[PDB]
Structures are given as structure tokens and as C-alpha cells.
Design a binder for this molecule. Structure first.
Ligand SMILES: CC(C)CCC[C@@H](C)[C@H]1CC[C@H]2[C@@H]3CC=C4C[C@@H](OC(=O)CCC(=O)O)CC[C@]4(C)[C@H]3CC[C@]12C
Ligand SMILES: CC(C)CCC[C@@H](C)[C@H]1CC[C@H]2[C@@H]3CC=C4C[C@@H](OC(=O)CCC(=O)O)CC[C@]4(C)[C@H]3CC[C@]12C
Ligand SMILES: CC(C)CCC[C@@H](C)[C@H]1CC[C@H]2[C@@H]3CC=C4C[C@@H](OC(=O)CCC(=O)O)CC[C@]4(C)[C@H]3CC[C@]12C
Ligand SMILES: CC(C)CCC[C@@H](C)[C@H]1CC[C@H]2[C@@H]3CC=C4C[C@@H](OC(=O)CCC(=O)O)CC[C@]4(C)[C@H]3CC[C@]12C
Ligand SMILES: CC(C)CCC[C@@H](C)[C@H]1CC[C@H]2[C@@H]3CC=C4C[C@@H](OC(=O)CCC(=O)O)CC[C@]4(C)[C@H]3CC[C@]12C
Ligand SMILES: CC(C)CCC[C@@H](C)[C@H]1CC[C@H]2[C@@H]3CC=C4C[C@@H](OC(=O)CCC(=O)O)CC[C@]4(C)[C@H]3CC[C@]12C
Ligand SMILES: CC(C)CCC[C@@H](C)[C@H]1CC[C@H]2[C@@H]3CC=C4C[C@@H](O)CC[C@]4(C)[C@H]3CC[C@]12C
Ligand SMILES: CC(C)CCC[C@@H](C)[C@H]1CC[C@H]2[C@@H]3CC=C4C[C@@H](O)CC[C@]4(C)[C@H]3CC[C@]12C
Ligand SMILES: CC(C)CCC[C@@H](C)[C@H]1CC[C@H]2[C@@H]3CC=C4C[C@@H](O)CC[C@]4(C)[C@H]3CC[C@]12C
Ligand SMILES: CC(C)CCC[C@@H](C)[C@H]1CC[C@H]2[C@@H]3CC=C4C[C@@H](O)CC[C@]4(C)[C@H]3CC[C@]12C
Lengths: 702, 702
């Protein structure tokens, strides 16, 4: 049974009886000393962290990893070639830049990356964010089809170079923990909005229509209007072939997911349908019989590096910041699943550095933004990916496609790629069945999800992330704005104290009120806390103090006039009744009422609760003690400290004690720094538990 | 002493023994029913709240309030005329609009306002924010010195009409509680930055220099450069007269503040120095002897109303929102001091409605934004202001100045007003002695103050408020990002549990770890909480489960091969030593390790902690129970719930119990909605206090 027999402590007798260890908190001088303390072991650790390949490559097991890595690399290389060709169209650049952006960051990540399963390249969200950034940049540059494509390519290279520089700077600064400011609900809402954006954007390629590059403020609706204002000019053959490809891919993906145990090395539907479509377009000549747009004959080989444009750097700072943040968050979210699945450590700063270097190299070599895509990562993992050697094999396949087999993929329909991209939208769009779950569960994360979706949809991907982050930060204040403050009472004559309106046989101590605030008190909570405390107490301590001071001043004036003769016990009051001549105070003297009462000159100790001569109101209070249950109060910063000090001073000045209960050692240590304690609000008002506070009150009363 | 003898409770036996009251929580259907339930008493209350004059005017005491109100009204009318003339120059409009904006909102507030001491009009922060909004609006108008000010006046009228409409909408929506999202540190920083802005902006009038209206991004530095690039063209007479006026005003204000008891009806230094300067300028002709700019001959009378410009409405939406928010916050902050001083209720929604209506009327009648100024409010309160009759008398004085005495104030130097405005900068600039105090106290509110100052200075008043609000919201996440998680232990063989690294004679139960998170756990805290819990425990439950599952699979394979014969007690193990032929698991099958172990088919109960045959590692764990001290955990939303569920499942699946301790009834009630409880994580794992949890563990063990 719960049996305890201990003395009553007040967080000061406790410390006096039990000696503390006197731990030395770390200062700032020694923080820099240990950082600059260079040692060979720490240097080797830093070098190995910066070059994870030097650690994971010599530990390769070339007996059970080589074949699986090779197969997974071939599969992911085919998928990466197809996905780069598809996503190069979203930026509205020649397709070969998609291959470049699928090749270069993977090669850089093979050296500088810490994850072992993700595949680096383009994914639709980042691709369209880069495209929007390019459209914004080329619309602000100070003043043919070939020239427009070249300027778009240059703008994309500059934007992705700046994004890689930002990512590398973030990784160097060791601030790679910024991924925790994005809630799971915010991630879900943003991903669903981006999925809708992808579905809207791929329509102009499915229908084979010319759509101008729109601007960030309202992009999806403008694109939809532009697409549906020319719906008559659609290509029926292109539309039907896109539908067939999408239907076949979705059906095969469904059967592949359903039949997993019986199906090793899952069917490469992307490759199979792509080669089928290319063979159908060839021979049958799906470029003159119909007017289907096809992927042009890409130049076999790479391209010389270019210097990024400082004008674009200046123009698209915010867009590049958003691109870097989105890429890092997506990469971390994708890599964390496989890291937890296969039990290896993940380094956020190393991931940021690798992504930044890869993006920088890709932009220097005329590419665009690169990260890991969920579809490609899942393909690589399911095929049997064990290390980044699969990524190297995929890069080799991409290089082979770029160099040798370049005449192929030319009869490609330039919209089978769009249908393949839309085939990856099923998992993204299935997240729409989350509003109901969040509404049933939280009712606040549902608000976060809805607001994030609306903000992204009506503001573009670049600004929706910032707006959603701001609203998600505000939702914490929403949570801790109106805490369910309640009065506590004893249950069963034990040390159990719960809500006053919950149980039946409870009992409160005579003239004792226990108040609990089940939320941290900060700038947005001090006023509500004070109002709730005053309402629970039942009177205003400031009002009581002011009325008592007015009564004392009237009594002193009467004594000066001689109507009141002071005696050791009682007042003579040699007047039956006065005409009740009240006195008013001017504007600059009303402060004196708030001053504490000191009746040392009067030998009689005024009770302020029984009766006053000459019929003075002086409202009485039956509350002779107050206990604050600061057990759930995590922190106070400035305004809460000032409000608490004012409330405690007002309470103490009317001859009632205040006790703070439930705070640990750290809370009182922090409060000591705020100059909270003084000659009035001593440090002995803190008690361990409500029962100790109540027992101390009872002991001091009788 | 502290003597307790009660049975051990687990928040379920407690509820079974003590019957709850079964309170009926209010739903949403009845929330609308009580709002639409119209009653005569509620209608009368609503009408009286909407028209507070009908409540406070009949209760007038015309024996002790009339004379003081008249004197305070005369003084505040003189001060309001001077301050309106001064602040009309900051917007760069003819001075008479300052008188209009000092007259109209005061008249509207006399009817629709709830405060009794504040004086409505212009104040420099709002005046310059309106000026910046006007400069932005006139710089974006589509193209079609006397005509240059007309468009500025029209833009100011439109901007203030929109701001008043926004304020009225906010008051109608009953969202007048938005003043609690601005911390005291944020308010102090913004006020100091605005003071610096005022000091910089008034330089062009002190030196009598022509400065173009700059734009929001970097305004103060551009104005400073423009002023100091033409410092040679300054007027020495204007500078010296401004210096004398400022010095005399500051000295007289200092002596007035110091000598308060001996000095009733504080000296009207503004009025006396203004009339002295006007008489000197008129007598000595300070318009041709020197080149001092003077206030022009304002047209005696009012001006017809104008329709606000929809183009300006569309152009300056954000600026109008900022103006409305700043005006409401300033008015509430100024009025709260006097409301607390004189003990009368304040209505935020009524204040918002009154301010919105006043601003709407003033903008319609060609004025600019109106609120209460601290200087004017202090003058009115000190002079003897009791009700808004002082405001009415001030409006009457302003009307008299507008109509009858208009030929005066013409020889005014147009910079003595600037020096008078500078004289009010002492109180604002005294707030610079707060960085040190906040650094010594909080180290977070100091960051808020510094960031607010920097953001406002380098982004303008309109955008600095939003940036500082965002950073202040982020500071809460900064506070609750890395909580000081610690292990707890018993002290003195009682029910007191504190930090493990704090005391000497502590003792932990055998194989029991107590973990405490002294902060609410949300999206930005779940990962850190999991990492700290794993580090405190000393092992990874997922790793232990995976290794145990691998060992079980190897044992089952050996049993199938016949090397292991299952017996009721022990394994025969008819092999001296095997060649240690480990088996690797490919992808799409590694998840089976995470599945829970169910050794029902084996009669032997595997201990998983003593030893295993054929030398299998199976790392042992000494921990056999875990207690989470969720006493300071205020709330979980989605991600924290999911992470807690995953951690608890991982712990339970390795045959260890988890106990959550310290949560109240509301926390478990909220957690029940998240579908947290299921067949594995039951609802009986919640306990009242750490001592109950420990006693239950000891009872279960033996
Ligand atoms: C509170 C939540 C819902 C977010 C607030 C919504 C606003 C940020 C949105 C809603 C309506 C939007 C506007 C709707 C229409 C237009 C007209 C549009 O002008 C054009 O026709 C541009 C044509 C072109 O240049 O291609 C430019 C964007 C704009 C101002 C939009 C800007 C963004 C606005 C103000
Ligand atoms: C995330 C935390 C840790 C740091 C965030 C810092 C950024 C918000 C600041 C720091 C430096 C700033 C940049 C400093 C200098 C400039 C140059 C400036 O261009 C000009 O000089 C104007 C030229 C012209 O208008 O002709 C445009 C803004 C920019 C990129 C600034 C954008 C905002 C930046 C990136
Ligand atoms: C419990 C789990 C397995 C989910 C069960 C429900 C889903 C199968 C349903 C519920 C809501 C459905 C969504 C409701 C609305 C839409 C929008 C719509 O997509 C669009 O094309 C919208 C964009 C546009 O074309 O303008 C059609 C599919 C989708 C995502 C639906 C896909 C199927 C969802 C996710
Ligand atoms: C992280 C903290 C420090 C706040 C972030 C700082 C930025 C928001 C500031 C710092 C430097 C500023 C820039 C400094 C210089 C200029 C050049 C200026 O161009 C002119 O010369 C305008 C001349 C005119 O039109 O009158 C336009 C604003 C701009 C880009 C400023 C925009 C706002 C910036 C980027
Ligand atoms: C603070 C919460 C409670 C509400 C916030 C809502 C605002 C952010 C939204 C709602 C209405 C919106 C306005 C609705 C209509 C217009 C007109 C529209 O502009 C045009 O039509 C431009 C035409 C052109 O460019 O020729 C887009 C901006 C604006 C001012 C919108 C700006 C954003 C506003 C103010
Ligand atoms: C209550 C006690 C502890 C006050 C302590 C005194 C100082 C901490 C304060 C009081 C007056 C302050 C000064 C008042 C006025 C100004 C002018 C101000 O001018 C500007 O902004 C730059 C000049 C320009 O704008 O041309 C700069 C800050 C400064 C020196 C202030 C710096 C901080 C000071 C010295
Ligand atoms: C290139 C331009 C001129 C093409 C025409 C653009 C028109 C069709 C676009 C631009 C802005 C768009 C609006 C922007 C925002 C919203 C709010 C949303 O909740 C419903 C759709 C609605 C109301 C959009 C309707 C379509 C719209 C009016
Ligand atoms: C006209 C020219 C001079 C305008 C200025 C362009 C150059 C100097 C600016 C534009 C964008 C800037 C970058 C924007 C963002 C960051 C991230 C930060 O963590 C480090 C600095 C860094 C990487 C900046 C470096 C300087 C930068 C590249
Ligand atoms: C003549 C008018 C039109 C334009 C004047 C432009 C020049 C003088 C202005 C515009 C932008 C200004 C800069 C904006 C921001 C900063 C950062 C701050 O920490 C120091 C001052 C500094 C570096 C300013 C110096 C002056 C500046 C360069
Ligand atoms: C040229 C045309 C398109 C411009 C249209 C301008 C008008 C219709 C718009 C522009 C800005 C709008 C205001 C912006 C903000 C709010 C605050 C909200 O709480 C009530 C409505 C209100 C006050 C809006 C009313 C309508 C408004 C005045």
C-alpha cells in the first residue's frame, strides 16, 4: 500500500537536509575551448564523417551484395532515365538536362552521401518549384524558340547553383536540424497540394497544348484556365495513348503491390511500356500520321560548364531558399524510412552537405535541382539495393543513355512520360483521406493540414511552405491560449488533488483555494491566467487593497479630527452616526491607495474582516491562503514573470499567503534569475506538493 | 508531519472507486442555440455595450467632475492641436488635416468608446506608417506642387478609410483578443525602433531640407542618406530655433516630472513655447529676414467628404492591415494602464469598433489615422481628466482653432512642431536600457527584442511587425526544442523523485528507469524525446527486438534441421559447435524481424536474458520496467502521439512494461481520441504518481 511518513518540505528545508551535488554547469568559455581542441582522433572522425565512402566502401561484402546491387542499379538507372526525361519537361527545358540532373548529383552523392538506399535525382515537386523560379526570374531580367530555351536553361542552372550553395552553407553551419520545424500534418498537406499541382501541370502535356509560364501568386488556377480555354485544340491520339499508358501502368503497379511474395524482381512496367510506346511510334510514324509532339534528337554528349548568373542569384533568392529547404526536407523524410528500416545512422548535416555539393555540380554542368524521389527510392530498395553502388550503376546507365543510345527515345511521345509521372501520383493523392482522420483525432492538426493545402494551392509552392510554417507555429499559441484552468480539492482525505467539478465526496480546506494552470504561461497566457485566477478566487485583490486603504485613510482622518480615540482593545467611537461625508482623490494621488498598509502606529491590530466603525464597507474576504499548482507550467519568460509578481504582490499586500507547488529545481533556478524574489515575495513560498502545502497551512493556522 | 496511508491507484481503480460526476461537455449545437436565443435583457446589454455613452453619461457627477474635466479638456485640446499640426507634416500633407484627424475620431470616440482617460488622435508611429503607405500607393498608381499634395491627401484618406473598415470588421468579428499575440518585449523593441524612425524622419524638418518620399524596404537609411547628402544646405536659424525649443521643452518636462506635489496643473510648456515662437516670428518677420519655412495660411473651415479610392484600397491592403493592427495595439496598451489605475472594465471589441468608426469618419472627411497617443493621454490624465467630456472639450478647442483662430499658427516655424515631437522621444528612447536587463534575465526575450529592433529598422514599420511576430512565435519552438530530459531517482526512501545528477544518497529501483520530459511534446520535440529516452535507457528497443527475432529464426531453423530437440526444460543441443553459418535476409522480408515474438509453439519459455545455445549473441537487457513522468507534458497533437505509440510498442514487444505517470484526467481523455489505446498499449499503463508506479512494479515483481 501507499504508505509514506516523511517531514513536510518546502523546497528549502529539503535542500538544507539533502545536500546537493553542486554540479558545475558548462559556461561559454569552455564551450569554445572543446570545439577548438584539435586532436588526431577527432580529426580522423571529422574526415571520415565528411567522406563516408572511405568508411562504407572498404567494408563492402562482395559475396552477397554485388549481384543485388547490380540488378537494383540497372533497374533504378532505367527508372532514373525515364523520370529525368519526364521531369525535364516540367521545367520546360530540353529533355537531356533531365538526364544530366539524374546523372551528376547521383555521382556526387556516391562519394559525399551517408544514406545507402535513396536514389538522387529530380522529383516533380522540386522540378516544378524550379520551373516557377525560372519563370519568375526570366520575367524580371533587364532587357526565338531557341533563345527562350537557352535562357530558361541558364536561369535553371543559376537557380539550382544558388540552391546548392544555400544547402552547402546550411550543412556547414550544422543547422541541419531545421527538418523538425515541419510537422507531419504540414508535410502531408504540402505533399497533397503538390500532387494536385503536378496533376494540373501535366495536363498541358497530356493534351499537347501551348500554355504560357505563369507566375507564383495564383499558378494552378491560371494554368487550369489556360489549358481548358483551348480544350478544343487537343490531340485525340495523344490523349488516348496517354490514357492507355496510365491505365496499364496503374494496373500493373496495383498487381505488383498485391502479389509481392510470388513476384521477385518486380516487373519494370515503366521500361516495358516505354519501349512498347517507342516501337509503336516508330514504323507507324506517330509524327506525320498524327501531330503528336515527340522528344527531339538530343545531342549525344555532355555540355561545357557555365558561370551562374548573378542577376538570377539576386532575383530568385527566396525561391532558391524555398527550393533548398524543400529538397532537404524531402530527402531527409525519404531517407529516414530506409534508415529506420535497415538500422544505420543518418547524419542530417552530412546529407545537407552532399545535396548542396551535388546541386552545385549539376548546376555548374547545366542541370537543375536534385534530391531523392520516393518512387525511385522505392524501386531501388525493392529491386535489392544494398549500398550506393546501385546509385553508381544507375549513373552509369544514365551516362550510357546520354552518350551511346541517344538516337532512341526520339520517337517517344513526350506525353507517355507525363502519364508515367502521373502514375506515381496514386500514393500522393491517397493522402486526401486524412482530413477526416485528423478531424476525428486532433481538430488542430486538421486545421494545420487544411490551411497548408489552401495556402499552397492559392499561393504557389514557394510561398505556401512559408505561410504553412507560420500558421503551424501560430497553432502552438492557439493550443496554449485558453488553458483549462480549474480549482482543485482533496479526494478521500489523502494526497490526491483533482478538478473541483469532477468528483462527489471531495472536500476543500477552510479558506484555502488551489489553482492549477495546465499549460505553460507566456506572453499570450498571462492575462487569461490572471483573469481565471481572479474569477476562481472570487474577488479582485487590487480592489480589496484599494478599498482597505480608503477605509484606513478615512479612519486616520477621523482619528485626527478626534472622533476616534485609539485604545488597546476597540475604538470608543464617541459619535452615534456621521453624515457619511466621503472624500474623493484627484488624478495624481490615486496611486497611494495601492500602497501596502502598515498599521504600526496604531496599537490595535485591525482585523479587516469583522467590523469597522462608522459603517465603512471594507468588503470581507474568507480566503486566507492560496496555492498555485505549477506542475504543468513549463516556462515563463518575461511578461508571465511580471504578471505573476504583480499578482503575488497584490495578494500578499492584503494579508494572504501565496504558495507555488510542483515546480522542479530547474524552474526555481530559472526564476531566481528574473529578480522575482525580493523582501516581499520570498523564496520560501515554493513547496514540493499540494499536500505538503496544505499541511503547512494547517500547521501554521493551528 | 506528512502521513499518508492509501491504496495504490492506477487511474482506473481510482475511477472505479471514486464515481465521477459525469459532467456534460458543451457541444456545438447548443453553442449556436444560446447565441441566437434573443432576450430583452441580453438585447439591452448589447445595446448598452454598443453605446457606452448611454451608460456612463447619465451617471455623471456634476459636483466634482465638471471643473476638472473642463481644465483637462482645455489642456488636451491645446496639446492635440499642436500635436496634430506636428504630425500632419510627417505624412507630408497640409497641416489642417492634422487638426481634422485630431477632431473627428475624438468626437466619434466620445460616443462609441469605453475608456475614460485616453485622448484620440494621431501619434507619430501611426502617422509615419500612414505616410509610408501613401508613398507606396502613389508610387504604384496607373498614370492617366499644389497637385502633388492633393493625390497624397486622397491616398491618405483612402488608406485610413480602409484601415477603419478593417478595424470595424475585427471588432464585429469579436476577435479583439489579437493584442495578446504581441509580447511586452516585442512591444518595447518595436517602440524603440519607431522612436529611432521618428528621430530620423524629423531631421528633414529640423534642418529644413527637401527629401523624397522613400519606400518601405529600407526607409530609415535612405532618409538618413538623403538628409546628410545635403547637410550643407541646412538653415542655421531653423536649426538653432529647433534646438532652443527642444532644450527648453526637455528641461521644463524634467522639472515638471521631478516637482509634482508642489506643482498643480502642470505647466503647458508646449503652449507657452509655441505662442512665444509665434510672437517672435511674427514680430521679427521670420520669413524674409531668414528663409525659415512656415506653416501656410490654412483655409478656415472643414472640407466636403470624398469617396475612398478602390485603386488605393487594392494597392495598400497589407499596409492598411498593419496600420489597423498597430493602432489597435497602441490604443489597448495605452488604455489598459489607466483602466487598471482607475478600476473600470475595458472592452477590446468595443474599443476596436470605436476606433474603426472614428477612422472611417475621419478618412471620409479628409483626415488620417486616429488612435490614442501616450503623451496626450498622460497630459489629459495629469491635468485632471475624469471622463470623455475632457475629450469633447479638446475636440471643441480643435474646432475653434480650425474655424475662428486660423490666421494664427501661420508664423509658426514648421520645425518648432518637429522639436515638440522630438521632446516626446525621451520616454521611448529610455527603453534602450532594456537589452542588458533582458540579457541578464531571460536570454530569449532579449533575442526577441534585438530581432524586433533589427527587423523593423531594416524592413520598415509595416513589415517589421510581421517579421517580429513570426520570430516571436518561433521563439516558443526555440524554448521547447531541446528540453532538459533527465533520469529520476528516489530520495530518502519516500515519494520524492528528483534529478539523477543532483543529490547524493539517492537510490533507483533494480531494473527500473524513470524518464521525465519537462516540456510539451509536439512535432518539433518527438525525435529529440525519443533520442534522449533511448540514450537514458541505454539500448535501442528496435535493435533488441530485431536481434531477438533473428536469434529465434535461427533457433527455429536449427530445430527444423534437427540439431535442437525441444524439451520442457532446456535444449539438448546434440552438437559441440557449428561453423557459425549466418543467414542474410534480403529486402521485402527484413520487416519480419520487427514483428512481435510469440513462442507459443515452444513449451520452453525462452528467457532471452540468461543464455542461448550454439553461441548466439542476443544482447541482454537488465531494464525490466520503464516509467514516464508526464507531469509537465502539456499536450500532444499527432506526431508526438505516433512517436509515443511506436516507442511504447517497441518497448512492450521486447517484454518490458511502460508506465505513464502524472497526467490529469483531461490528458488521458484527449489521448483516448487519438486511437492511442489498442490490444497492445492498454489504458491501464497510466498511473497517478511515480511512487504509485514504483510500488506497483515492486508488487508485481514480488
Ligand atoms: C487567406 C488565404 C485564403 C490566402 C489569401 C488569398 C490571396 C493571397 C489570394 C486570393 C486571391 C488572389 C488574387 C486573385 C487574382 C489575381 C489577379 C492576377 O492577375 C492576372 O490576371 C495576371 C495575369 C498574368 O500576368 O498572367 C494576379 C494575381 C491576383 C492578384 C491574386 C493574388 C493572390 C490573391 C490575392
Ligand atoms: C536562415 C538564417 C540563418 C539566415 C538568413 C539570412 C537571409 C534572410 C539574408 C542574409 C543575407 C541577405 C542578402 C544580402 C544581400 C542581398 C543583395 C540584394 O541586392 C542588392 O544589393 C540590390 C541591388 C538592386 O536592387 O539593384 C538583394 C537581397 C540580398 C540577396 C539579401 C537577401 C536576404 C539574405 C540572404
Ligand atoms: C483508408 C485509405 C485506404 C483511403 C481510402 C479512401 C480513398 C480510396 C479515397 C478517399 C478520398 C479520395 C480522393 C478524393 C478526391 C480526389 C481528388 C481528385 O483528383 C483530381 O484530379 C483533383 C484535381 C483536379 O483535377 O482539379 C480525384 C481523386 C482524389 C485524390 C480521391 C482519390 C481516392 C481517395 C483518396
Ligand atoms: C536577417 C536580418 C538581418 C534581416 C534580413 C535583411 C534583409 C531583409 C535586408 C538587408 C539588406 C537589404 C537590402 C539592402 C539594399 C537594397 C537596395 C535597394 O535599392 C535601392 O538602392 C533603391 C533606391 C530607390 O529606389 O530609391 C532596395 C532594397 C535592398 C535590396 C534591401 C532589401 C532588404 C535587405 C535585403
Ligand atoms: C486576416 C484574415 C482573417 C483574413 C485575410 C484575408 C486577406 C489576406 C485577403 C481576403 C480578401 C483578399 C483581397 C480580395 C480582392 C483583391 C483584389 C485582387 O486584385 C485584382 O483584382 C488585381 C487586378 C489587376 O491587377 O488589374 C487581388 C487582391 C485583393 C486586394 C485581395 C488581397 C488579399 C485579401 C485582402
Ligand atoms: C534608466 C537608465 C538605466 C538609462 C540608461 C541610459 C542609456 C542606456 C540610454 C539613455 C539615453 C539613451 C540614448 C538616447 C538617444 C540616443 C540617440 C539615438 O540616435 C540615433 O538613432 C542615431 C542618430 C541619428 O539618428 O542621426 C541613438 C541612441 C541614443 C544615443 C540612446 C542610447 C542609449 C541611452 C544612452
Ligand atoms: C492570363 C490571365 C489573364 C488568365 C485569366 C486568369 C483567371 C481566369 C484566374 C486568375 C485568378 C483566378 C482566381 C484566383 C483565386 C480564386 C479563389 C479560389 O478559391 C477559387 C478560384 C479563384 C476565384 C480563381 C479563379 C480563376 C482566376 C480569376
Ligand atoms: C548585384 C549583386 C551584387 C547582388 C548580390 C548577389 C550575391 C552577392 C548574393 C545573392 C544571393 C546571396 C546568397 C543568398 C543566401 C545565402 C545563404 C546564407 O546562409 C549564406 C549566404 C548566401 C549563400 C548568400 C551569399 C551572397 C549571394 C549569392
Ligand atoms: C539616393 C537614394 C535614392 C538611394 C540611396 C542608396 C544607399 C545610400 C542606401 C540604400 C540601401 C542602404 C543600405 C541598406 C542596408 C544596410 C545594412 C545596415 O546594417 C547598414 C546600412 C546599410 C549598408 C545601408 C547603407 C545605405 C544604403 C546603401
Ligand atoms: C480593382 C478591384 C479588383 C479592387 C477591389 C478592391 C476591394 C473590392 C477589396 C480590396 C481590399 C478588400 C478588403 C481587404 C481586407 C478586408 C478585411 C476583412 O476582414 C473584411 C473585408 C476587407 C475590408 C476587404 C473588403 C474588400 C476590399 C476593399
Amino acid at each position: 500500500q501507499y504508505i509514506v511518513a516523511r517531514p513536510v518540505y518546502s523546497t528549502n528545508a529539503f535542500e538544507e537536509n539533502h545536500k546537493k551535488t553542486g554540479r558545475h554547469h558548462k559556461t561559454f568559455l569552455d564551450h569554445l575551448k572543446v570545439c577548438c581542441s584539435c586532436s588526431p582522433q577527432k580529426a580522423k572522425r571529422i574526415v571520415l564523417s565528411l567522406f563516408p565512402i572511405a568508411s562504407w566502401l572498404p567494408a563492402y561484402r562482395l559475396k552477397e551484395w554485388l549481384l543485388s546491387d547490380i540488378v537494383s542499379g540497372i533497374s533504378t538507372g532505367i527508372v532514373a532515365v525515364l523520370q529525368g526525361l519526364a521531369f525535364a519537361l516540367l521545367v520546360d527545358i530540353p529533355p537531356v538536362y533531365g538526364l544530366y540532373a539524374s546523372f551528376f548529383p547521383a555521382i556526387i552523392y556516391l562519394f559525399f552521401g551517408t544514406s545507402r538506399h535513396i536514389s538522387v535525382g529530380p522529383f516533380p515537386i522540386l522540378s516544378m518549384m524550379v520551373g516557377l523560379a525560372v519563370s519568375g526570374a526570366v520575367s524580371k531580367a533587364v532587357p526565338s524558340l531557341l533563345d527562350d530555351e537557352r535562357v530558361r536553361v541558364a536561369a535553371a542552372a543559376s537557380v539550382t547553383v544558388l540552391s546548392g550553395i544555400i544547402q552547402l552553407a546550411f550543412g556547414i553551419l550544422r543547422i541541419g536540424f531545421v527538418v523538425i520545424y515541419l510537422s507531419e500534418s504540414l508535410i502531408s498537406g504540402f505533399t497533397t497540394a503538390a500532387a494536385v499541382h503536378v496533376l494540373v501541370s501535366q495536363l498541358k502535356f497530356i493534351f499537347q497544348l501551348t500554355v504560357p509560364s505563369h507566375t507564383d501568386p495564383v499558378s494552378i488556377f491560371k494554368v487550369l484556365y489556360s489549358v481548358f480555354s483551348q480544350i478544343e485544340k487537343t490531340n485525340i491520339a495523344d490523349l488516348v495513348t496517354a490514357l492507355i499508358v496510365l491505365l496499364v501502368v496503374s494496373i500493373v503497379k496495383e498487381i505488383n503491390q498485391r502479389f509481392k511474395d510470388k513476384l521477385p524482381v518486380p516487373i519494370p512496367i515503366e521500361f516495358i511500356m516505354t519501349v512498347i510506346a517507342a516501337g509503336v511510334s516508330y514504323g507507324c510514324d506517330f509524327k506525320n500520321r498524327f501531330k503528336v509532339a515527340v522528344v527531339g534528337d538530343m545531342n549525344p554528349g555532355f555540355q561545357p560548364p557555365i558561370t551562374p548568373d548573378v542577376e538570377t542569384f539576386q532575383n530568385t533568392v527566396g525561391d532558391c531558399f524555398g527550393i533548398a529547404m524543400v529538397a532537404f526536407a524531402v530527402a531527409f523524410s525519404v531517407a529516414s524510412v530506409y534508415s529506420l528500416k535497415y538500422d544505420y545512422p543518418l547524419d542530417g548535416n552530412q546529407e545537407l552537405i552532399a545535396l548542396g555539393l551535388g546541386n552545385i555540380v549539376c548546376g555548374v554542368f547545366r542541370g537543375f535541382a536534385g534530391s531523392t524521389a520516393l518512387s525511385r527510392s522505392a524501386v531501388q530498395e525493392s529491386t535489392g539495393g544494398k549500398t550506393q553502388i546501385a546509385g553508381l550503376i544507375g549513373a552509369i546507365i544514365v551516362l550510357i543513355v546520354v552518350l551511346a543510345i541517344g538516337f532512341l527515345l526520339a520517337p517517344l511521345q513526350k506525353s507517355v512520360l507525363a502519364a508515367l509521372a502521373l502514375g506515381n501520383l496514386k500514393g500522393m493523392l491517397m493522402q486526401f483521406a486524412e482530413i477526416g482522420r485528423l478531424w476525428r483525432k486532433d481538430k488542430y492538426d486538421c486545421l494545420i493540414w487544411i490551411m497548408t493545402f489552401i495556402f499552397t494551392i492559392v499561393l504557389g509552392l514557394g510561398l505556401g511552405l512559408a505561410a504553412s510554417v507560420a500558421f503551424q507555429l501560430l497553432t502552438i499559441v492557439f493550443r496554449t491560449q485558453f488553458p483549462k484552468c480549474s480549482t482543485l480539492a482533496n479526494i478521500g482525505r489523502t494526497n490526491i488533488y483533482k478538478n473541483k467539478k469532477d468528483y462527489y465526496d471531495m472536500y476543500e480546506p477552510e479558506g484555502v483555494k488551489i489553482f492549477r494552470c495546465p499549460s505553460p504561461i507566456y506572453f499570450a497566457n498571462i492575462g487569461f491566467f490572471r483573469r481565471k485566477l481572479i474569477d476562481a478566487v472570487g474577488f479582485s485583490p487590487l480592489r480589496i487593497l484599494r478599498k482597505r486603504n480608503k477605509a484606513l485613510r478615512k479612519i486616520r482622518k477621523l482619528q485626527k479630527q478626534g472622533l476616534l480615540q485609539v485604545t488597546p482593545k476597540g475604538f470608543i467611537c464617541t459619535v452615534d452616526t456621521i453624515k457619511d461625508s466621503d472624500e474623493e482623490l484627484d488624478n495624481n494621488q490615486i496611486e497611494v491607495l495601492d500602497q501596502p498598509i502598515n498599521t504600526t502606529d496604531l496599537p490595535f491590530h485591525i482585523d479587516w474582516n469583522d467590523d469597522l466603525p462608522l459603517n465603512i464597507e471594507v468588503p470581507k474576504i474568507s480566503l486566507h491562503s492560496l496555492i498555485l499548482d505549477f506542475s504543468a507550467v513549463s516556462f515563463l519568460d518575461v511578461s508571465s514573470v511580471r504578471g505573476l509578481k504583480s499578482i503575488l504582490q497584490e495578494f500578499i499586500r492584503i494579508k494572504v499567503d501565496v504558495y507555488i507547488v510542483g515546480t522542479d529545481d530547474d524552474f526555481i533556478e530559472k526564476l531566481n534569475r528574473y529578480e522575482f524574489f525580493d523582501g516581499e515575495v520570498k523564496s520560501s513560498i515554493f513547496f514540493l506538493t499540494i499536500h505538503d502545502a496544505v499541511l503547512h497551512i494547517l500547521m501554521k493556522k493551528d
